[PDB]
Amino acid sequence: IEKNSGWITMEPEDMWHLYNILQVGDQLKASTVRRILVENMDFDTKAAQLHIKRTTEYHPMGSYHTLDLELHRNFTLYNEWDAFALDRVDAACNPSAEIGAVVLDEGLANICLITDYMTILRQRIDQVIPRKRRGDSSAYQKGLDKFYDSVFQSINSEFDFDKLKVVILASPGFVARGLYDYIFSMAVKLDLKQIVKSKNKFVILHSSTGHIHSLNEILKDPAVESKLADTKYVQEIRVLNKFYDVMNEDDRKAWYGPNHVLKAFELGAIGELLISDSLFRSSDIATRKKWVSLVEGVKEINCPVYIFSSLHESGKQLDLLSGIAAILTYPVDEEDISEDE
Amino acid sequence: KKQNPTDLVSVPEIFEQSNPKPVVHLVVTGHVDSGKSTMLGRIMFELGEIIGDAPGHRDFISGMIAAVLVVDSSQNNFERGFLENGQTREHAYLLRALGISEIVVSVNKLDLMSWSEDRFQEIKNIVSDFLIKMVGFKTSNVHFVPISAISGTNLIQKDSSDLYKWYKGPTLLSALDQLVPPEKPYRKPLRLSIDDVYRSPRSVTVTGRVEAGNVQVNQVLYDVSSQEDAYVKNVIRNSDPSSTWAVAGDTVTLQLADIEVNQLRPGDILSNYENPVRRVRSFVAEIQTFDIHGPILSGSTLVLHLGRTVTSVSLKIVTVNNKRSRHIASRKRALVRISFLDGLFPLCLAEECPALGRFILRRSGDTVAAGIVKELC
């Protein structure tokens, strides 16, 4: 397929890999309804669709189209296949374990499906729970039962319990234990063979909040280490926390931000310490080149590189801290500007 | 597509008719063995001649914090080395981190050290070095008052105590009376916080506080959060009177007419369309940091805790101890820009409205900082 430039012809995650692969200036084609210069990519996070946006071939030319990608039917790409561009186009396919995760607090639920490269929010449930009146607890109780019923209904439609290896329930208080009991009662009452088969796969965890970032708390929980440690999403949580442990020991051994990591790379500072983000997929060619180079640079020496997926909470967190960070091998003193807002 | 009310032709907040005194808000801190508890009781008792409420010719609603105007620490006279070392120390830190600038320090039980002025000065120092040197209080906002909770200099200098041999200052009550509260908050634009929301007969009921301004029956309230409005159908002020209005400081239980229940959530602030509350995506804040494990990085995700609203935010560093910085460690001031991860939230500057501008920051389960909002974006 690949001489020296070319083209390639080729799971819902594979739409994501492609989103990363695609670049403005590229050309591709497949079936649609009525070959384009790629100008816009649009990934519906939820997550069937990939929308790619003019007509660069025969027309039985110079007018916009949009592709709306299919998942099993194939397509054809198109001059500079980057080292990054190639490690994704090569990743999946060829592939290799899905996880359901419900983060809740009292009137709040986040229903997530998690894979190696993706965390997707299937349902947010946000209901107002009236407070307990010191003489009356009805409005609270009725509000609480509507909520229990709501997440139940949601997971029961969102989750396919044959596919997932684990479904986690996590809350700060009693909600997650209350739910586990509620789920399986109702599923025994009504006859729901799907869930009753899956009881062994459910784990109930502590969590500080019912907000999504709480996902970095678990899936690092010891109780779930056994079943999950070989996943990308846990690997990202580890490294990030490894990064934090060092920040904590010596703030001269943990850098973050573009101008900081580059600087660190000019020195010998960089080691088991590339924490880099898929979100470096800019359209400016000049500025794509440098990240590919840096990753190549640390890769040609024997130091790990971690390209976090911007979809995970871990990855989101890495983005907030401008999407590069690095641990260091020695303590370095400096004072660099970082070029942002 | 929506169409605003508008207002009726009704009354003006006629609070002033019945000559009211400013209601000043306190939090009272101190060890269990400072006479903190006796001091309050003795104030109740002596004002007895002539949540805890004392009036003089101001009115002191004292409360707890573990949103309010001033504070006092009280402590005691024993073998003083070790304590000062409780978690009254952390209380002092918290109050600074939040708005509070003025403390009164009740120096209790000097009668037990025979009203010795050298003892009062000794302890004034140990305390001044913690409240001033180590925590950010100005010397001129920390007032010291000698006392005996088992009747002292709290109400009347009308003691012929050995104390008034050397001591020329005010009584505790007078030291409190010299602290200037916010001018006339019942006049400032209306801010009403929502504590709870639930359906009723021909109204959605809301309960909460009048954070500033005033509110009366048959008026229009605006909810910046759901972009919706309502008619006040009833107002239960403090007790359960046949009240028809409420003013800044009163807890309220309202009944709202032309609004549906789901368009009104705890943590919302309602107001008039005139000088409405502003909902923002991000703000600037002066936080102050506590004992924390890892430092707060610029870009960190924390959970902000304001009223009933607790929500996920990211914090970007502007400056730390007035210098540019890449991390904010324990026991440090910082100017920061905080962004909500979950949409637009309504708030005020702490200048305008403490209870609406003072918040707490936490990381996983640990609280790591507190601050005041200084700017809206």
mmCIF file of all heavy atoms in Angstrom, chain B residues 107-152:
data_model
loop_
_atom_site.group_PDB
_atom_site.id
_atom_site.type_symbol
_atom_site.label_atom_id
_atom_site.label_comp_id
_atom_site.label_asym_id
_atom_site.label_seq_id
_atom_site.Cartn_x
_atom_site.Cartn_y
_atom_site.Cartn_z
ATOM 1 N N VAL B 107 -10.201 37.997 75.016
ATOM 2 C CA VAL B 107 -9.180 37.445 75.879
ATOM 3 C C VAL B 107 -9.865 37.113 77.187
ATOM 4 O O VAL B 107 -10.147 37.989 77.994
ATOM 5 C CB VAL B 107 -8.047 38.452 76.104
ATOM 6 C CG1 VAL B 107 -6.985 37.876 77.058
ATOM 7 C CG2 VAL B 107 -7.452 38.870 74.752
ATOM 8 N N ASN B 108 -10.143 35.836 77.379
ATOM 9 C CA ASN B 108 -11.005 35.425 78.460
ATOM 10 C C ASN B 108 -10.237 34.925 79.667
ATOM 11 O O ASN B 108 -9.126 34.379 79.547
ATOM 12 C CB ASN B 108 -12.007 34.366 77.973
ATOM 13 C CG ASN B 108 -13.254 34.279 78.843
ATOM 14 O OD1 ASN B 108 -13.495 35.121 79.708
ATOM 15 N ND2 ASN B 108 -14.052 33.249 78.616
ATOM 16 N N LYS B 109 -10.855 35.138 80.828
ATOM 17 C CA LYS B 109 -10.441 34.559 82.095
ATOM 18 C C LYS B 109 -9.198 35.221 82.670
ATOM 19 O O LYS B 109 -8.396 34.568 83.342
ATOM 20 C CB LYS B 109 -10.243 33.048 81.959
ATOM 21 C CG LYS B 109 -11.391 32.318 81.274
ATOM 22 C CD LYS B 109 -11.316 30.856 81.575
ATOM 23 C CE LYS B 109 -12.012 30.049 80.516
ATOM 24 N NZ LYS B 109 -11.556 28.636 80.553
ATOM 25 N N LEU B 110 -9.050 36.520 82.409
ATOM 26 C CA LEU B 110 -7.964 37.303 83.000
ATOM 27 C C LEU B 110 -8.101 37.482 84.504
ATOM 28 O O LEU B 110 -7.095 37.654 85.194
ATOM 29 C CB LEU B 110 -7.819 38.668 82.331
ATOM 30 C CG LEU B 110 -6.785 38.811 81.217
ATOM 31 C CD1 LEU B 110 -6.875 40.194 80.600
ATOM 32 C CD2 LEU B 110 -5.385 38.545 81.735
ATOM 33 N N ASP B 111 -9.331 37.449 85.012
ATOM 34 C CA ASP B 111 -9.543 37.470 86.457
ATOM 35 C C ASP B 111 -8.764 36.347 87.136
ATOM 36 O O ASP B 111 -8.236 36.520 88.232
ATOM 37 C CB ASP B 111 -11.031 37.427 86.824
ATOM 38 C CG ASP B 111 -11.798 36.290 86.154
ATOM 39 O OD1 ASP B 111 -11.395 35.768 85.092
ATOM 40 O OD2 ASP B 111 -12.861 35.928 86.697
ATOM 41 N N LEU B 112 -8.647 35.218 86.451
ATOM 42 C CA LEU B 112 -7.894 34.076 86.964
ATOM 43 C C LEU B 112 -6.386 34.311 87.020
ATOM 44 O O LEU B 112 -5.686 33.659 87.796
ATOM 45 C CB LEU B 112 -8.203 32.825 86.138
ATOM 46 C CG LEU B 112 -9.665 32.387 86.033
ATOM 47 C CD1 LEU B 112 -9.744 31.097 85.267
ATOM 48 C CD2 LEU B 112 -10.299 32.237 87.403
ATOM 49 N N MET B 113 -5.891 35.225 86.189
ATOM 50 C CA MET B 113 -4.496 35.661 86.249
ATOM 51 C C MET B 113 -4.464 37.094 86.796
ATOM 52 O O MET B 113 -3.691 37.953 86.341
ATOM 53 C CB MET B 113 -3.824 35.555 84.874
ATOM 54 C CG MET B 113 -4.087 34.251 84.115
ATOM 55 S SD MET B 113 -3.497 32.704 84.861
ATOM 56 C CE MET B 113 -1.713 32.822 84.708
ATOM 57 N N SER B 114 -5.340 37.318 87.780
ATOM 58 C CA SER B 114 -5.476 38.575 88.540
ATOM 59 C C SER B 114 -5.397 39.844 87.697
ATOM 60 O O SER B 114 -4.666 40.786 88.011
ATOM 61 C CB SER B 114 -4.514 38.614 89.729
ATOM 62 O OG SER B 114 -3.315 37.928 89.438
ATOM 63 N N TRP B 115 -6.190 39.843 86.631
ATOM 64 C CA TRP B 115 -6.244 40.921 85.648
ATOM 65 C C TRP B 115 -4.885 41.513 85.269
ATOM 66 O O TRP B 115 -4.804 42.718 85.020
ATOM 67 C CB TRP B 115 -7.201 42.033 86.100
ATOM 68 C CG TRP B 115 -8.625 41.581 86.321
ATOM 69 C CD1 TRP B 115 -9.245 41.407 87.521
ATOM 70 C CD2 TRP B 115 -9.603 41.260 85.321
ATOM 71 N NE1 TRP B 115 -10.541 40.995 87.336
ATOM 72 C CE2 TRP B 115 -10.787 40.899 85.994
ATOM 73 C CE3 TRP B 115 -9.595 41.243 83.924
ATOM 74 C CZ2 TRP B 115 -11.955 40.521 85.316
ATOM 75 C CZ3 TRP B 115 -10.754 40.863 83.254
ATOM 76 C CH2 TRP B 115 -11.915 40.512 83.952
ATOM 77 N N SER B 116 -3.838 40.679 85.202
ATOM 78 C CA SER B 116 -2.478 41.186 84.899
ATOM 79 C C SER B 116 -2.299 41.634 83.451
ATOM 80 O O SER B 116 -2.505 40.860 82.509
ATOM 81 C CB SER B 116 -1.352 40.224 85.337
ATOM 82 O OG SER B 116 -1.309 39.035 84.571
ATOM 83 N N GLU B 117 -1.921 42.901 83.307
ATOM 84 C CA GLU B 117 -1.742 43.542 82.011
ATOM 85 C C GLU B 117 -0.613 42.900 81.205
ATOM 86 O O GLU B 117 -0.682 42.830 79.976
ATOM 87 C CB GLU B 117 -1.474 45.033 82.201
ATOM 88 C CG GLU B 117 -1.492 45.844 80.913
ATOM 89 C CD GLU B 117 -1.171 47.307 81.130
ATOM 90 O OE1 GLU B 117 -1.187 47.754 82.290
ATOM 91 O OE2 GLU B 117 -0.905 48.011 80.132
ATOM 92 N N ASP B 118 0.422 42.432 81.896
ATOM 93 C CA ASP B 118 1.523 41.739 81.236
ATOM 94 C C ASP B 118 1.071 40.430 80.592
ATOM 95 O O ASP B 118 1.558 40.053 79.517
ATOM 96 C CB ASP B 118 2.679 41.516 82.207
ATOM 97 C CG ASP B 118 3.549 42.749 82.357
ATOM 98 O OD1 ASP B 118 3.586 43.567 81.405
ATOM 99 O OD2 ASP B 118 4.201 42.901 83.415
ATOM 100 N N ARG B 119 0.120 39.756 81.238
ATOM 101 C CA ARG B 119 -0.470 38.546 80.673
ATOM 102 C C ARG B 119 -1.309 38.854 79.428
ATOM 103 O O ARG B 119 -1.205 38.151 78.427
ATOM 104 C CB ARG B 119 -1.286 37.787 81.719
ATOM 105 C CG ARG B 119 -1.887 36.484 81.219
ATOM 106 C CD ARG B 119 -0.831 35.459 80.860
ATOM 107 N NE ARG B 119 -1.431 34.136 80.718
ATOM 108 C CZ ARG B 119 -0.794 33.042 80.312
ATOM 109 N NH1 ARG B 119 0.496 33.076 79.986
ATOM 110 N NH2 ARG B 119 -1.461 31.902 80.224
ATOM 111 N N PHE B 120 -2.112 39.915 79.492
ATOM 112 C CA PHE B 120 -2.888 40.372 78.342
ATOM 113 C C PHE B 120 -1.999 40.735 77.151
ATOM 114 O O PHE B 120 -2.328 40.403 76.010
ATOM 115 C CB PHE B 120 -3.741 41.566 78.741
ATOM 116 C CG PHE B 120 -4.561 42.137 77.628
ATOM 117 C CD1 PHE B 120 -5.674 41.459 77.140
ATOM 118 C CD2 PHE B 120 -4.248 43.383 77.093
ATOM 119 C CE1 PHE B 120 -6.452 42.003 76.122
ATOM 120 C CE2 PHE B 120 -5.019 43.938 76.072
ATOM 121 C CZ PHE B 120 -6.125 43.244 75.584
ATOM 122 N N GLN B 121 -0.877 41.412 77.417
ATOM 123 C CA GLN B 121 0.065 41.777 76.359
ATOM 124 C C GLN B 121 0.801 40.555 75.825
ATOM 125 O O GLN B 121 0.989 40.419 74.611
ATOM 126 C CB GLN B 121 1.052 42.846 76.827
ATOM 127 C CG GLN B 121 0.454 44.262 76.888
ATOM 128 C CD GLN B 121 0.036 44.808 75.520
ATOM 129 O OE1 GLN B 121 0.741 44.634 74.522
ATOM 130 N NE2 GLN B 121 -1.117 45.476 75.477
ATOM 131 N N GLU B 122 1.198 39.660 76.731
ATOM 132 C CA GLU B 122 1.840 38.417 76.325
ATOM 133 C C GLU B 122 0.972 37.696 75.309
ATOM 134 O O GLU B 122 1.436 37.337 74.239
ATOM 135 C CB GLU B 122 2.111 37.511 77.523
ATOM 136 C CG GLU B 122 2.531 36.112 77.113
ATOM 137 C CD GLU B 122 2.900 35.215 78.283
ATOM 138 O OE1 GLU B 122 2.770 35.642 79.456
ATOM 139 O OE2 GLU B 122 3.334 34.069 78.015
ATOM 140 N N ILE B 123 -0.296 37.503 75.636
ATOM 141 C CA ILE B 123 -1.176 36.710 74.780
ATOM 142 C C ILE B 123 -1.603 37.472 73.525
ATOM 143 O O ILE B 123 -1.706 36.882 72.457
ATOM 144 C CB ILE B 123 -2.354 36.022 75.580
ATOM 145 C CG1 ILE B 123 -3.495 35.586 74.659
ATOM 146 C CG2 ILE B 123 -2.902 36.912 76.672
ATOM 147 C CD1 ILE B 123 -4.588 36.634 74.454
ATOM 148 N N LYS B 124 -1.809 38.780 73.644
ATOM 149 C CA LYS B 124 -1.990 39.634 72.468
ATOM 150 C C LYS B 124 -0.885 39.401 71.434
ATOM 151 O O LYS B 124 -1.167 39.339 70.239
ATOM 152 C CB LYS B 124 -2.059 41.116 72.857
ATOM 153 C CG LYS B 124 -2.110 42.091 71.680
ATOM 154 C CD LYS B 124 -2.587 43.466 72.125
ATOM 155 C CE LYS B 124 -2.313 44.532 71.073
ATOM 156 N NZ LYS B 124 -0.895 44.998 71.115
ATOM 157 N N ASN B 125 0.362 39.259 71.887
ATOM 158 C CA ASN B 125 1.465 38.947 70.977
ATOM 159 C C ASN B 125 1.332 37.574 70.317
ATOM 160 O O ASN B 125 1.170 37.489 69.097
ATOM 161 C CB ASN B 125 2.823 39.091 71.669
ATOM 162 C CG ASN B 125 3.136 40.527 72.032
ATOM 163 O OD1 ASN B 125 2.737 41.459 71.327
ATOM 164 N ND2 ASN B 125 3.847 40.716 73.140
ATOM 165 N N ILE B 126 1.378 36.507 71.119
ATOM 166 C CA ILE B 126 1.246 35.139 70.586
ATOM 167 C C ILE B 126 0.108 35.047 69.564
ATOM 168 O O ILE B 126 0.270 34.438 68.501
ATOM 169 C CB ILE B 126 1.079 34.071 71.701
ATOM 170 C CG1 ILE B 126 2.257 34.137 72.683
ATOM 171 C CG2 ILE B 126 0.936 32.668 71.097
ATOM 172 C CD1 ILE B 126 2.199 33.111 73.792
ATOM 173 N N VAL B 127 -1.016 35.689 69.873
ATOM 174 C CA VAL B 127 -2.173 35.693 68.972
ATOM 175 C C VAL B 127 -1.972 36.611 67.758
ATOM 176 O O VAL B 127 -2.331 36.232 66.638
ATOM 177 C CB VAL B 127 -3.503 36.004 69.721
ATOM 178 C CG1 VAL B 127 -4.651 36.191 68.752
ATOM 179 C CG2 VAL B 127 -3.835 34.882 70.689
ATOM 180 N N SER B 128 -1.395 37.795 67.974
ATOM 181 C CA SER B 128 -1.116 38.736 66.876
ATOM 182 C C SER B 128 -0.130 38.161 65.864
ATOM 183 O O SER B 128 -0.241 38.434 64.672
ATOM 184 C CB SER B 128 -0.590 40.077 67.392
ATOM 185 O OG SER B 128 -1.645 40.979 67.669
ATOM 186 N N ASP B 129 0.819 37.360 66.335
ATOM 187 C CA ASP B 129 1.802 36.759 65.447
ATOM 188 C C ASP B 129 1.205 35.669 64.567
ATOM 189 O O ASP B 129 1.699 35.407 63.471
ATOM 190 C CB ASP B 129 3.010 36.249 66.227
ATOM 191 C CG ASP B 129 3.891 37.385 66.738
ATOM 192 O OD1 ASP B 129 3.716 38.543 66.273
ATOM 193 O OD2 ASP B 129 4.757 37.118 67.602
ATOM 194 N N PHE B 130 0.134 35.044 65.033
ATOM 195 C CA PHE B 130 -0.520 34.053 64.219
ATOM 196 C C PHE B 130 -1.548 34.695 63.295
ATOM 197 O O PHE B 130 -1.612 34.374 62.110
ATOM 198 C CB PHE B 130 -1.170 32.969 65.067
ATOM 199 C CG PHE B 130 -1.996 32.018 64.264
ATOM 200 C CD1 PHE B 130 -1.407 30.939 63.621
ATOM 201 C CD2 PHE B 130 -3.364 32.230 64.106
ATOM 202 C CE1 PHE B 130 -2.167 30.082 62.855
ATOM 203 C CE2 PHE B 130 -4.133 31.368 63.339
ATOM 204 C CZ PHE B 130 -3.534 30.297 62.717
ATOM 205 N N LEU B 131 -2.351 35.602 63.835
ATOM 206 C CA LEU B 131 -3.406 36.226 63.049
ATOM 207 C C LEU B 131 -2.844 37.225 62.059
ATOM 208 O O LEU B 131 -3.413 37.420 60.988
ATOM 209 C CB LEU B 131 -4.460 36.893 63.947
ATOM 210 C CG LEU B 131 -5.263 36.016 64.922
ATOM 211 C CD1 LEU B 131 -6.344 36.841 65.617
ATOM 212 C CD2 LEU B 131 -5.878 34.799 64.207
ATOM 213 N N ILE B 132 -1.720 37.842 62.407
ATOM 214 C CA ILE B 132 -1.128 38.862 61.543
ATOM 215 C C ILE B 132 0.074 38.343 60.732
ATOM 216 O O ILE B 132 0.009 38.285 59.503
ATOM 217 C CB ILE B 132 -0.831 40.171 62.329
ATOM 218 C CG1 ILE B 132 -2.117 40.649 63.015
ATOM 219 C CG2 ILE B 132 -0.268 41.257 61.407
ATOM 220 C CD1 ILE B 132 -1.907 41.522 64.214
ATOM 221 N N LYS B 133 1.149 37.939 61.403
ATOM 222 C CA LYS B 133 2.333 37.453 60.682
ATOM 223 C C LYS B 133 2.038 36.263 59.762
ATOM 224 O O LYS B 133 2.369 36.302 58.578
ATOM 225 C CB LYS B 133 3.491 37.130 61.635
ATOM 226 C CG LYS B 133 3.931 38.326 62.472
ATOM 227 C CD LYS B 133 5.372 38.240 62.940
ATOM 228 C CE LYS B 133 5.765 39.558 63.571
ATOM 229 N NZ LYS B 133 7.122 39.533 64.180
ATOM 230 N N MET B 134 1.390 35.234 60.312
ATOM 231 C CA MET B 134 1.231 33.934 59.655
ATOM 232 C C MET B 134 -0.015 33.853 58.782
ATOM 233 O O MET B 134 -0.048 33.110 57.800
ATOM 234 C CB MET B 134 1.170 32.844 60.718
ATOM 235 C CG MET B 134 1.488 31.443 60.226
ATOM 236 S SD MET B 134 2.027 30.410 61.596
ATOM 237 C CE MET B 134 3.551 31.235 62.091
ATOM 238 N N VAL B 135 -1.051 34.588 59.173
ATOM 239 C CA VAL B 135 -2.267 34.707 58.375
ATOM 240 C C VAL B 135 -2.424 36.195 57.990
ATOM 241 O O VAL B 135 -1.882 37.080 58.653
ATOM 242 C CB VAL B 135 -3.519 34.153 59.127
ATOM 243 C CG1 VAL B 135 -4.565 33.687 58.135
ATOM 244 C CG2 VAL B 135 -3.167 32.981 60.026
ATOM 245 N N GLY B 136 -3.155 36.480 56.921
ATOM 246 C CA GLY B 136 -3.084 37.813 56.320
ATOM 247 C C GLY B 136 -3.778 39.013 56.945
ATOM 248 O O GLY B 136 -3.947 40.031 56.271
ATOM 249 N N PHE B 137 -4.181 38.926 58.209
ATOM 250 C CA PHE B 137 -4.956 40.015 58.808
ATOM 251 C C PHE B 137 -4.108 41.239 59.058
ATOM 252 O O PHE B 137 -2.955 41.119 59.475
ATOM 253 C CB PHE B 137 -5.582 39.597 60.132
ATOM 254 C CG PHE B 137 -6.926 38.951 60.001
ATOM 255 C CD1 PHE B 137 -7.210 37.797 60.696
ATOM 256 C CD2 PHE B 137 -7.928 39.518 59.229
ATOM 257 C CE1 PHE B 137 -8.453 37.190 60.597
ATOM 258 C CE2 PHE B 137 -9.184 38.906 59.134
ATOM 259 C CZ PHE B 137 -9.440 37.742 59.821
ATOM 260 N N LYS B 138 -4.691 42.412 58.815
ATOM 261 C CA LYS B 138 -4.057 43.692 59.136
ATOM 262 C C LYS B 138 -4.092 43.928 60.646
ATOM 263 O O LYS B 138 -5.052 43.525 61.310
ATOM 264 C CB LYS B 138 -4.785 44.829 58.418
ATOM 265 C CG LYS B 138 -5.030 44.573 56.931
ATOM 266 C CD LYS B 138 -5.555 45.815 56.237
ATOM 267 C CE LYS B 138 -5.385 45.707 54.732
ATOM 268 N NZ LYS B 138 -4.900 47.012 54.166
ATOM 269 N N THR B 139 -3.060 44.579 61.192
ATOM 270 C CA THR B 139 -3.015 44.861 62.635
ATOM 271 C C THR B 139 -4.221 45.680 63.080
ATOM 272 O O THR B 139 -4.770 45.455 64.160
ATOM 273 C CB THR B 139 -1.728 45.608 63.070
ATOM 274 O OG1 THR B 139 -1.538 46.769 62.250
ATOM 275 C CG2 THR B 139 -0.501 44.701 62.978
ATOM 276 N N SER B 140 -4.639 46.614 62.229
ATOM 277 C CA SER B 140 -5.735 47.539 62.543
ATOM 278 C C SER B 140 -7.145 46.959 62.343
ATOM 279 O O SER B 140 -8.137 47.651 62.595
ATOM 280 C CB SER B 140 -5.569 48.839 61.750
ATOM 281 O OG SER B 140 -4.907 48.593 60.513
ATOM 282 N N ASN B 141 -7.228 45.703 61.896
ATOM 283 C CA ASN B 141 -8.510 44.988 61.823
ATOM 284 C C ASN B 141 -8.644 43.850 62.843
ATOM 285 O O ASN B 141 -9.622 43.090 62.811
ATOM 286 C CB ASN B 141 -8.755 44.458 60.413
ATOM 287 C CG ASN B 141 -9.021 45.556 59.417
ATOM 288 O OD1 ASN B 141 -9.683 46.551 59.724
ATOM 289 N ND2 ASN B 141 -8.505 45.384 58.205
ATOM 290 N N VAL B 142 -7.658 43.740 63.734
ATOM 291 C CA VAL B 142 -7.667 42.762 64.819
ATOM 292 C C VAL B 142 -7.722 43.493 66.170
ATOM 293 O O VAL B 142 -6.725 44.034 66.642
ATOM 294 C CB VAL B 142 -6.452 41.799 64.736
ATOM 295 C CG1 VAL B 142 -6.494 40.773 65.834
ATOM 296 C CG2 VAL B 142 -6.420 41.100 63.400
ATOM 297 N N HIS B 143 -8.903 43.508 66.776
ATOM 298 C CA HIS B 143 -9.140 44.237 68.012
ATOM 299 C C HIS B 143 -9.100 43.296 69.211
ATOM 300 O O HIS B 143 -9.668 42.213 69.166
ATOM 301 C CB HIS B 143 -10.506 44.930 67.956
ATOM 302 C CG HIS B 143 -10.756 45.695 66.690
ATOM 303 N ND1 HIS B 143 -10.549 47.057 66.586
ATOM 304 C CD2 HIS B 143 -11.207 45.289 65.478
ATOM 305 C CE1 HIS B 143 -10.864 47.456 65.366
ATOM 306 N NE2 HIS B 143 -11.266 46.402 64.673
ATOM 307 N N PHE B 144 -8.448 43.700 70.293
ATOM 308 C CA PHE B 144 -8.358 42.833 71.468
ATOM 309 C C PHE B 144 -9.185 43.368 72.636
ATOM 310 O O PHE B 144 -9.176 44.564 72.918
ATOM 311 C CB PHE B 144 -6.898 42.610 71.879
ATOM 312 C CG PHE B 144 -6.123 41.736 70.931
ATOM 313 C CD1 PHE B 144 -5.505 42.280 69.807
ATOM 314 C CD2 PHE B 144 -5.998 40.367 71.170
ATOM 315 C CE1 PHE B 144 -4.783 41.470 68.910
ATOM 316 C CE2 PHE B 144 -5.280 39.546 70.293
ATOM 317 C CZ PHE B 144 -4.671 40.103 69.155
ATOM 318 N N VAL B 145 -9.910 42.473 73.302
ATOM 319 C CA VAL B 145 -10.811 42.871 74.378
ATOM 320 C C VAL B 145 -10.672 41.895 75.532
ATOM 321 O O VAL B 145 -10.967 40.720 75.368
ATOM 322 C CB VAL B 145 -12.287 42.940 73.894
ATOM 323 C CG1 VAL B 145 -13.225 43.331 75.036
ATOM 324 C CG2 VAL B 145 -12.436 43.926 72.729
ATOM 325 N N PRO B 146 -10.211 42.377 76.707
ATOM 326 C CA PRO B 146 -10.114 41.515 77.896
ATOM 327 C C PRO B 146 -11.518 41.209 78.392
ATOM 328 O O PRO B 146 -12.427 41.995 78.143
ATOM 329 C CB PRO B 146 -9.388 42.397 78.923
ATOM 330 C CG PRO B 146 -8.978 43.634 78.189
ATOM 331 C CD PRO B 146 -9.902 43.778 77.036
ATOM 332 N N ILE B 147 -11.706 40.093 79.089
ATOM 333 C CA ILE B 147 -13.053 39.620 79.423
ATOM 334 C C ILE B 147 -13.077 38.625 80.554
ATOM 335 O O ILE B 147 -12.089 37.970 80.838
ATOM 336 C CB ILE B 147 -13.758 39.069 78.139
ATOM 337 C CG1 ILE B 147 -14.793 40.068 77.661
ATOM 338 C CG2 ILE B 147 -14.398 37.694 78.304
ATOM 339 C CD1 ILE B 147 -14.764 40.192 76.180
ATOM 340 N N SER B 148 -14.211 38.543 81.228
ATOM 341 C CA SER B 148 -14.500 37.375 82.033
ATOM 342 C C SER B 148 -15.921 36.925 81.734
ATOM 343 O O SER B 148 -16.888 37.556 82.163
ATOM 344 C CB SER B 148 -14.294 37.645 83.523
ATOM 345 O OG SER B 148 -13.719 36.510 84.156
ATOM 346 N N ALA B 149 -16.033 35.834 80.976
ATOM 347 C CA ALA B 149 -17.331 35.234 80.663
ATOM 348 C C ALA B 149 -18.257 35.052 81.887
ATOM 349 O O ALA B 149 -19.447 35.305 81.787
ATOM 350 C CB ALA B 149 -17.138 33.935 79.922
ATOM 351 N N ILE B 150 -17.712 34.634 83.030
ATOM 352 C CA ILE B 150 -18.439 34.643 84.330
ATOM 353 C C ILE B 150 -18.589 36.124 84.845
ATOM 354 O O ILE B 150 -18.093 36.497 85.919
ATOM 355 C CB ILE B 150 -17.750 33.645 85.339
ATOM 356 C CG1 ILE B 150 -17.600 32.260 84.693
ATOM 357 C CG2 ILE B 150 -18.529 33.488 86.610
ATOM 358 C CD1 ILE B 150 -16.333 31.491 85.082
ATOM 359 N N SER B 151 -19.271 36.949 84.025
ATOM 360 C CA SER B 151 -19.375 38.437 84.118
ATOM 361 C C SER B 151 -18.019 39.136 84.002
ATOM 362 O O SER B 151 -17.116 38.862 84.821
ATOM 363 C CB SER B 151 -20.061 38.874 85.406
ATOM 364 O OG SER B 151 -19.190 38.659 86.489
ATOM 365 N N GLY B 152 -17.878 40.050 83.029
ATOM 366 C CA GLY B 152 -16.557 40.623 82.687
ATOM 367 C C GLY B 152 -16.521 42.074 82.257
ATOM 368 O O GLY B 152 -16.994 42.943 82.984
#
